[PDB]
């Protein structure tokens, strides 16, 4: 009969189930989808006897989205308490080794970390990992997170599923429209989810139907990319991984799912406190949740927000540049480790926003800008960079586009070229503090002069005083008879770009135009003792495999003597200590900090070039129209810099002698004495025996 028509009717839906079943198969059966490339900071490892302090520790564990507690239940978590701190350190896939949760004890004595013992066996730590924090993503328009099934709490699928559905068989049905269908109302649509459903949870399991929902979800928007899956969601909303959400937080996200764009925190938080709280009863009506556990729910506030998009712009150029440099888009889950340290940045960012508005008060300022670049002193590696006094939101970055003169910044430069000569130039050594009139070509004079326009009494300065005090005049002579090419050469050794070096007398005293970066780079050579390590933000990129698809390793090499980089910081404390940035070593005495001050003519740019015990700060506060500041490089940098400084626990600077290097007295006069004399000065000398000669 009608069965010529209803059978044949049932076997053509068949072959549609066919190719059906082959589209779902090819997706999940391979790439599911294209997630962006995860962006980690520095990772800390902590050993017995670590110079860190218990309040270092906080700030550290804090910079590391971690929570302070009473009591300790979840990872992510931690208790302080008198002379220690305990710890839930959370599992992270460390390049190094695979690792999960540990209870660990971080005993302290003092200004260093004494002990960490793993609390599960009283056992002392040789050294203990500390994760990552998470600085963004490199987003399709759609930004992932991959967290596997055992990721997720079993309380927050129990969340999920009283929410949404009994799952004995929709969840399965939602998952399909999200991963292969329109976004039409459709009846056409519903049938072909209903009939995908029933082919998806036939040849797939409950637990990969929950491992790919979980993560296809769109939970929220951050402009032009899809927040989407629990995992990204909950440190998009919160700032913690899916595996420590608190209840509350696990109910709003859950609740997002239904219309995250209306049930969303940030614009109308009471539609989105509403749902949270529609949500917690949902979980209450089942047996799962006691009635004593919902009223503090309710009131307490599921966000509890950031509250904030483009996370680190300043530091993320960096990173982006290097990493076509080094090589990568066609790949797919990729973990990119960077040298960024938060708690550097953080000092940094709040020196930074405060420091402008304030010295845009204090000195009447229509508009200021500033610059900050903090790289280790010996490797290089790049831990903060700040491009502005707004450094939250950015476009334009002032720590590596911003080209300004470096002013006085240039000296040292001059002086350790001479200072490389220890059988010709001293820290001793009397260079002629008087009029100047160098005749420079078309017949014109160039006369430089130093900042009061006044010289020495004598006529001549120590030329320890002459970089101390910043004197033009001095610097002029002593580079002059030096030799530009030899200044020149100096600054192909610190690291500075060569095609902005040009090498005419001006020169000397700040006609060189850098970016705050490349001024970093030159001072982590004197700072290193000698040795420039190019500056880097990759510490290392692995694939999804785990594949080491790129490493760094160090390439320092030796540019200037040691003893000559030693001679030069020497001064370059003395400069902090009763020279130019003397306001710094009065507010620090205990840090024996060295740097230097640079000022620009009609006060254009302020320079600070900051060295501690394990930093390399490069600040600079000026304005994008190039007119006067009315601020000097102590009043400017150095008071952001100073701002910096309190901002965190600075390392002192035990600046620790190469060989060679010997304490001499000097007279007044500035002749070597076998014993006494009115000034101690280190000297390069295998025998000090240049006394002898002198007396
Ligand atoms: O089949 C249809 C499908 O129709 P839908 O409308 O898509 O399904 C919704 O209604 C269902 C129902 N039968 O009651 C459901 C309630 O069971 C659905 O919830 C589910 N499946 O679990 C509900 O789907 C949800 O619908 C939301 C949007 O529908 C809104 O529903 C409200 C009440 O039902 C209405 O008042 C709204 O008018 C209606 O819009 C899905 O959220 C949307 O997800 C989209 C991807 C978002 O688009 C983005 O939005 C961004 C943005 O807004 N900013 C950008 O513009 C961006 O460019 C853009 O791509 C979009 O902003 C976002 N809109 C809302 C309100 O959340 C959200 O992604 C989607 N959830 C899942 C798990 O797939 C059906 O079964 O009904
Ligand atoms: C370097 O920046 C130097 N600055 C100047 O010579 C400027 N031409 C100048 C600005 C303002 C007043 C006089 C000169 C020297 N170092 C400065 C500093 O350490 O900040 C300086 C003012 C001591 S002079």
Redesign the pocket.
């Known amino acids: 009969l009608l069965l010529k028509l209803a059978i044949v009717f049932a076997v053509l839906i068949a072959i549609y189930g066919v190719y059906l079943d082959q589209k779902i198969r090819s997706r999940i059966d391979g790439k599911v989808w294209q997630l962006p490339a995860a962006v980690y900071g520095r990772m800390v490892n902590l050993e017995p006897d670590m110079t860190i302090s218990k309040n270092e520790m906080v700030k550290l564990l804090e910079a590391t989205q971690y929570r302070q507690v009473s009591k300790m239940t979840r990872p992510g978590e931690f208790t302080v308490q008198a002379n220690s701190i305990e710890m839930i350190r959370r599992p992270f896939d460390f390049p190094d080794s695979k690792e999960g949760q540990v209870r660990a004890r971080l005993t302290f004595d003092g200004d260093h970390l004494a002990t960490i013992v793993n609390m599960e066996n009283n056992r002392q730590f040789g050294f203990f990992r500390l994760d990552p924090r998470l600085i963004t993503m490199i987003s399709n328009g759609e930004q992932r997170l991959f967290v596997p099934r055992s990721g997720f709490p079993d309380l927050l699928v129990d969340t999920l599923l009283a929410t949404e559905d009994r799952h004995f068989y929709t969840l399965t049905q939602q998952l399909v429209k999200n991963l292969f269908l329109s976004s039409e109302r459709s009846y056409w649509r519903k049938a072909n989810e209903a009939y995908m459903a029933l082919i998806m949870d036939a040849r797939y399991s409950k637990d990969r139907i929950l491992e790919l929902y979980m993560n296809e979800v769109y939970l929220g928007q951050s402009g032009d990319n899809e927040i989407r899956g629990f995992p990204l969601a909950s440190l998009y909303y919160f700032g913690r991984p899916v595996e420590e959400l608190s209840l509350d937080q696990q109910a709003l996200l859950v609740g997002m799912v239904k219309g995250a764009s209306i049930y969303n925190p940030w614009r109308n938080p009471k539609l989105a406190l509403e749902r949270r709280n529609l949500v917690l009863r949902l979980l209450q009506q089942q047996q799962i949740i006691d009635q004593e556990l919902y009223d503090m729910l309710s009131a307490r506030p599921l966000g509890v927000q950031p509250r904030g998009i483009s996370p680190q712009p300043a530091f993320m150029q960096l990173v982006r540049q290097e990493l076509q440099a080094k090589l990568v888009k066609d790949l797919s889950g990729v973990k990119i480790f960077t040298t960024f340290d938060s708690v550097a940045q953080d000092a940094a960012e709040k020196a930074a926003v405060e420091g402008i508005p304030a010295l845009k008060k204090q000195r009447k300022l229509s508009d200021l800008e500033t610059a900050i670049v903090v790289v280790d002193r010996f490797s290089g590696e790049v831990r903060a960079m700040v491009g502005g006094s707004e450094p939250q939101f950015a476009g334009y970055n002032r720590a590596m586009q911003a080209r300004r003169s470096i ?5 040292p430069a001059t002086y350790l070229t001479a200072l490389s000569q220890p059988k010709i130039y001293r820290l001793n050594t009397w260079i002629a503090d008087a009029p100047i009139a160098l005749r420079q070509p078309n017949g014109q004079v160039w006369s ?5 326009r006044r010289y020495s009494e004598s006529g001549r300065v120590m030329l320890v005083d002459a970089l101390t ?4 005049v001095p610097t002029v002579n002593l580079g002059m008879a030096l030799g530009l090419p030899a200044v020149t050469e100096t600054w192909i050794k610190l690291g500075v770009p060569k095609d902005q070096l040009h090498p005419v007398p001006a020169m000397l ?2 006609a060189l135009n850098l970016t705050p970066i490349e001024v970093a780079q030159a001072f982590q050579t004197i700072a290193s003792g000698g040795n420039r390590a190019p500056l880097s933000a990759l510490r290392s990129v692995i694939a999804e495999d785990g594949k080491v698809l790129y490493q760094s390793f160090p390439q320092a090499e030796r540019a200037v003597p040691a003893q000559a980089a030693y001679l030069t910081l020497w001064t370059m404390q003395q400069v902090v200590q009763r020279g ?2 003397r306001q710094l070593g009065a507010k620090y005495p205990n840090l024996h900090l060295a740097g ?8 254009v ?3 600070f070039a900051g060295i501690d015990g394990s930093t390399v700060t490069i600040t600079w506060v000026g304005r994008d129209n190039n007119q006067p500041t009315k601020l ?3 009043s400017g940098a150095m008071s952001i810099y100073q701002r910096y400084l309190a901002n965190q626990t600075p390392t002192p600077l035990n600046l620790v002698p190469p060989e060679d290097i010997a304490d001499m007295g000097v007279d007044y006069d500035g002749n070597f004495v076998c014993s006494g004399g009115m000034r101690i000065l280190p000297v390069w000398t295998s025998d000090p025996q240049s006394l002898c000669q002198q007396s």
């Open positions: 002013g006085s910044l240039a000296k430089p002069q130093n900042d009061d005090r910043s004197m033009n005293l700040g130019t940035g230097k001050t640079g000022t620009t003519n009609n006060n740019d302020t320079w000097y490089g102590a």
